[PDB]
Amino acid sequence: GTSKLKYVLQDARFFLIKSNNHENVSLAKAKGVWSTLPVNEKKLNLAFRSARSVILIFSVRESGKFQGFARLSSESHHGGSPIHWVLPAGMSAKMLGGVFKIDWICRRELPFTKSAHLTNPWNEHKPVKIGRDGQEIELECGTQLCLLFPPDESIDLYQVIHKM
Numbered sequence: 001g002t003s004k005l006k007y008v009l010q011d012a013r014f015f016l017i018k019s020n021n022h023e024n025v026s027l028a029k030a031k032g033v034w035s036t037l038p039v040n041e042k043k044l045n046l047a048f049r050s051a052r053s054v055i056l057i058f059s060v061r062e063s064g065k066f067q068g069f070a071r072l073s074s075e076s077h078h079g080g081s082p083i084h085w086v087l088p089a090g091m092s093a094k095m096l097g098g099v100f101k102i103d104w105i106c107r108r109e110l111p112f113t114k115s116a117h118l119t120n121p122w123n124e125h126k127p128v129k130i131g132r133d134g135q136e137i138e139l140e141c142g143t144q145l146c147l148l149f150p151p152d153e154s155i156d157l158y159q160v161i162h163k164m
């Protein structure tokens with residue numbers, strides 16, 4: 001069904017996350033964590049306090065798809081177990097910063113060809129696939145985008161609802 005998913009997304013905020021590679025999304029799916037640059041980290045921490053759910057929608061650059069979406073379960077924190085992210089050649093791991101805990105809502109992919117009818121008012125009404133890492137997606141567009149993903153029958157949203 002879609003009813004618990006709609007409940008989780010009600011009055012949520014949504015952010016596009018762009019990963020340079022599949023490896024970091026695979027790590028995020030295995031470990032329930034994400035890290036971003038400080039500019040986006042500050043935005044996500046503000047949003048986490050502001051809304052009942054903050055949803056990250058992931059897309060690997062050049063893949064032509066989204067790889068799934070997840071809900072922040074924490075603000076960012078330092079000092080945890082290190083994550084061996086793959087970073088650009090010139091970048092150190094400290095340039096990233098804190099680690100957000102996330103609960104996956106859908107680990108399945110959605111090709112950009114399926115979201116061509118959705119535009120993001122917060123990015124000049126460009127197709128929702130277009131945007132920089134951290135771009136906020138307006139509520140209606142983000143909700144409709146999440147509802148386009150194939151159902152992930154491995155997920156039980158019961159425990160996520162209780163965290164809200």
Ligand SMILES: CNC(=O)c1n[nH]c2c1CCCC2
Pocket residue numbers: 018019020024034035036037085086087088133
């Ligand atoms: C795990 N997090 C990431 O791989 C990430 N998220 N945003 C950026 C990066 C690396 C490159 C700079 C911009």
